[PDB]
Amino acid sequence: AHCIGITDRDFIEGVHGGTWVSATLEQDKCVTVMAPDKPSLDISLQTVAIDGPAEARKVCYSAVLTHVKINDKCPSTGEAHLAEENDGDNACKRTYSDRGWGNGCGLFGKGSIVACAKFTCAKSMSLFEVDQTKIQYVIRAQLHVGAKQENWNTDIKTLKFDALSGSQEAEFTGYGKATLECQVQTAVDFGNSYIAEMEKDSWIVDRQWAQDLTLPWQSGSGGIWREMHHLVEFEPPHAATIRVLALGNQEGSLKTALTGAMRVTKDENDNNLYKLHGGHVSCRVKLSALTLKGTSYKMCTDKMSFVKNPTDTGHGTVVMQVKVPKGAPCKIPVIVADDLTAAVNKGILVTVNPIASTNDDEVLIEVNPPFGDSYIIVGTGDSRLTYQWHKEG
Amino acid sequence: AHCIGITDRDFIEGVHGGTWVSATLEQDKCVTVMAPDKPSLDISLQTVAIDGPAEARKVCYSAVLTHVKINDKCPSTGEAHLAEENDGDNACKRTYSDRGWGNGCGLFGKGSIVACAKFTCAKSMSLFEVDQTKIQYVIRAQLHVGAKQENWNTDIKTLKFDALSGSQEAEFTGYGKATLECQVQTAVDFGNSYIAEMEKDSWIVDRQWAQDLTLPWQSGSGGIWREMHHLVEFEPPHAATIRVLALGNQEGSLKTALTGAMRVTKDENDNNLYKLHGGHVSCRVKLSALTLKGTSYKMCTDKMSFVKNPTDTGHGTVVMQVKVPKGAPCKIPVIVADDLTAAVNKGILVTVNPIASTNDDEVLIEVNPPFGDSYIIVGTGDSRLTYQWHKEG
């Protein structure tokens, strides 16, 4: 909805003594449901999302080190100690340096040595937990009633589904209502998944993969960086010195490891929602309460015009925009015929029974013409609009 | 030099009728050369370096994108174009977007679209060419003459070598001279090698490895980043937009790919030189001009003292520092004996013929005592110093 603007589009016809029509809605796709003596119904999968997930952890991939302190003791003089050893925001390591007269000691041998450094995570990845019972999914539902493309967004009904809302109605005034009984298949995940976020990017990742990461992590909710040694490297001691270095930025390596994982985006307006770039919806569509309006309205006889010529949609259909100048409440007659003389229509009309509601209005018509050469005819009498069309595919 | 201060130490002795004796000097190691009736000569490999290598290339691992511009054209309206498409510091991409009435075009079908962005390398790795004949290497040469450790550095003779020069002398006052005829074996490779440096860290890498890196590169002199697409991703077009992104920082991945490669450091106060963390030097040592000083001295008869008690060096040797307050230009008798009464020496003296030149002088003596229990006896008479010693290792 509207399916004309969407490239990947499927037309579905049901038996018309058919009440339900099952259809599947995939991402970036759309479905036009057509039923005889019934208005056409565009449905499309808008979003499959997760509403405000619990941030479980943070995983540092960029860390800097400051205030490197070291305490050293000569052989047989005892075990070394630093005060920062009693501080969580410091990474420390304990070793033994080869010491003697060369480096200011009394005895030759192993001297205890400790090195500490202040750990600051510059950049981290957030890991959110995912509950299956948090999934909302959205379906656009719209009727073919001759609305101009500029009026599509305002005419679209947005149907939101939960683990509780699984049968939604779509009410189109004057045309009744349609009932969607839908069900989300979000591919896989859950009982073994995280929402991993790096700034603006987000993915669905495996929990065991994320917990086996050779990177420092942090809780909710704050606290301390766990396993800080994954980004801290202590070079072997020399006399009374130890070089402490932070490892390189692991952004690119992580992102490389995240190729193939399902993408996720957080949205900016407005709720912290996590839209999945996957999954699909299986719906049951009830069309019985859809009534074809133009329930009355004489048909407009007066000379009309093509505001927008018949154009190929790429869907095997054609779209037109016709203006009705002297047509106070009108019905637009539209036929597609093998030739002008034989008025035998063979075009299946998508915009079923089009209406010009107001004095001087412009209506959008969509028709599915037969293969080969044909004639798109709009109106009757001498002011019949004709437009020759060809179909290939 | 001094080999007592260096843990990894090898003793090499030459024959009596020997002028020349060959030895190999490795990094962080040291060699004590011993010759009968001749002072022991500590040699050590200090550095193997390259002075100002030629910068061959630059490889960007951190890139930012600015000034993202986009040009789009409707179907059958022609090819899209940006001026920035013909600018060198910009990454551009040419594609086709699915367009129609849905996104404000007149026809349904492909519309040509261009996306450009200003490319700025935030961080790059420098790649230097290295000339095999500019390798300079430095060797410390020092004699065992009883100098205290605080006077070691001042007594060390520093010998600088080049690719062709080649043969250096070490002249010690009172003890003659030694001649080193050395040759640097720098392991591998050169000619097909680069000095790759990131910030302060540096390595020796293969040229073809660096040229095959899936990263944007540049020819130093002047600036043009080639293959920007290795750090730029243009997501598939949607309507009239293409979002252009910089990839993540590739520092950690590069540093990981450089694990195992030989390390290099540039230093600050030998001034911007690239020391190899590898290679070794093979030398021929001429000892013929080495004279044992003070071999016509009288014996120290007088009460001496231990300024520094005999301590284990970790080399299986012991070091002592003895004061000679009253003795006048004499030589210090040093023996290690299985018993005090029969004072029969079984310790080989590293400090061959230690002498007290001035009264109240403190001499550093190193002895290789026999295994097990022994008696370190220094001097004669009732005031001969004794120190009972134990050896295992």
List the helices and strands and how they pair.
Two copies of one chain form a homodimer.
Chain A: E1 8-13, E2 20-26, E3 29-35, E4 38-51, E5 54-72, E6 90-99, E7 109-129, E8 135-143, H1 152-155, E9 157-161, E10 167-172, E11 176-185, E12 193-198, E13 201-206, H2 207-211, E14 217-218, E15 232-234, E16 244-246, H3 251-257, E17 263-266, E18 273-276, E19 280-286, E20 305-312, E21 318-324, E22 330-331, E23 334-337, E24 348-349, E25 355-356, E26 361-368, E27 372-378, E28 385-391
Parallel strand pairs in A: 1-3
Antiparallel strand pairs in A: 2-19, 3-4, 4-8, 4-18, 5-7, 5-14, 6-7, 7-12, 8-9, 10-11, 11-19, 12-13, 13-17, 15-16, 17-18, 20-21, 21-26, 22-25, 23-27, 24-26, 27-28
Task: Describe what you observe in this structure.
The structure is a homodimer of 393-residue chains. Chain A is 4% helix and 50% strand. Chain A is mainly beta and 393 residues long. The first copy, chain A, has four domains: 139 residues, Tick-borne Encephalitis virus Glycoprotein, domain 1, CATH 2.60.98; 74 residues, Viral Envelope Glycoprotein, domain 2; 79 residues, Viral Envelope Glycoprotein, domain 3, CATH 3.30.387; 101 residues, Immunoglobulin-like, CATH 2.60.40.350. In chain A, the strands form six sheets. In chain A, strands 1, 3, 4, 5, 6, 7, 8, 9, 12, 13, 14, 17 and 18 form a 13-stranded mixed β-sheet that branches. A four-stranded antiparallel β-sheet of chain A has the order 2-19-11-10, with no helix packed on it. A four-stranded antiparallel β-sheet of chain A has the order 20-21-26-24, with no helix packed on it. In chain A, a hairpin with a 2-residue loop joins strand 12 and strand 13. The first copy, chain A, is rod-shaped, with a radius of gyration of 34 Å. The interface between A and B is medium-sized, with 33 and 33 residues.
